[PDB]
C-alpha cells in the first residue's frame, strides 16, 4: 500500500461452503483486506471497500444481500444505471480512499492479485498499456483502478476487447459512488 502497489490473494471458502453460505446468508469467516472476492451461485467477481462501503457491479451482485456473521445484509445503495451496489463494509475489511491528485496513470488490480497499468483516456475509460486476453480480466468486475498512491479512482466495469484481447477498460469513477450515495 502507498509506495509501490503490491497485492496478494487468499481463498477463504470452497464450492460447497460458498453454496451453503449463499443460502443461509450467514458468514462466520474473518474478513481482511480492501478487495473481497465474491460469488453468487452463477458468477464470481470482486467488491472493493471504499470509505466504509463495500461496492461492486450491479451486473454481478444484482440486488442481492451480502452474507454476514449476522445473517444477510441489505444493500445500502443500488444504481442500475451506474451499475453499482454497495453494502456496509464487512467488519474486518480496510477501506481505500478516493484519489485526490487527478493522476492519469492508473493501476487495475485483478482477482489474481495482479496490478496492471492503465492509461486514463476519458474519465471512465483507460487503455491497457499491455493488452491481455479477455479471459484474464473475467472475474475482476468490481475491482479497483488505483492511482500511483493507492487511492481509488474507479471500479473496473467492462473490457474493450476485439478478437479476444482487451485493449481498454471501462470503469465506474469514484465520483459516481458519491453521486449514488447522494442519490
Amino acid at each position: 500500500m502507498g509506495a509501490p502497489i503490491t497485492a496478494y490473494a487468499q481463498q477463504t471458502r470452497g464450492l460447497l461452503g460458498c453454496i451453503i453460505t449463499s443460502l443461509t446468508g450467514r458468514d462466520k469467516n474473518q474478513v481482511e483486506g480492501e478487495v473481497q472476492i465474491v460469488s453468487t451461485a452463477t458468477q464470481t467477481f470482486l467488491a472493493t471497500c471504499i470509505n466504509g462501503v463495500c461496492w461492486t457491479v450491479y451486473h454481478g451482485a444484482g440486488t442481492r444481500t451480502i452474507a454476514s456473521p449476522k445473517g444477510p445484509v441489505i444493500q445500502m445503495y443500488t444504481n442500475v444505471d451506474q451499475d453499482l451496489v454497495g453494502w456496509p463494509a464487512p467488519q474486518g475489511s480496510r477501506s481505500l480512499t478516493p484519489c485526490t491528485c487527478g493522476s492519469s496513470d492508473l493501476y487495475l488490480v485483478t482477482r489474481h492479485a495482479d496490478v496492471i497499468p492503465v492509461r486514463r483516456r476519458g474519465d471512465s475509460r483507460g487503455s491497457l498499456l499491455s493488452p491481455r486476453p479477455i479471459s484474464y480480466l473475467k472475474g475482476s468486475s468490481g475491482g479497483p483502478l488505483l492511482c500511483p498512491a493507492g487511492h481509488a479512482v474507479g471500479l473496473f466495469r467492462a473490457a474493450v476487447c476485439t478478437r479476444g484481447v482487451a485493449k481498454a477498460v471501462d470503469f465506474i469513477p469514484v465520483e459516481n459512488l458519491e453521486t449514488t450515495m447522494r442519490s
Binding site: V35, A67, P72
Partner: peptide, 22 residues
C-alpha cells in the same frame, strides 16, 4: 435469491517482507 458470498480477499496493504523460516 441467494446472498453474495465472500470467497477470498486481495490485500493491498501488505509491504515486502522476509518470509519467516518455519
Amino acid at each position: 435469491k441467494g446472498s453474495v458470498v465472500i470467497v477470498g480477499r486481495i490485500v493491498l496493504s501488505g509491504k515486502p517482507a522476509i518470509i519467516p523460516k518455519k
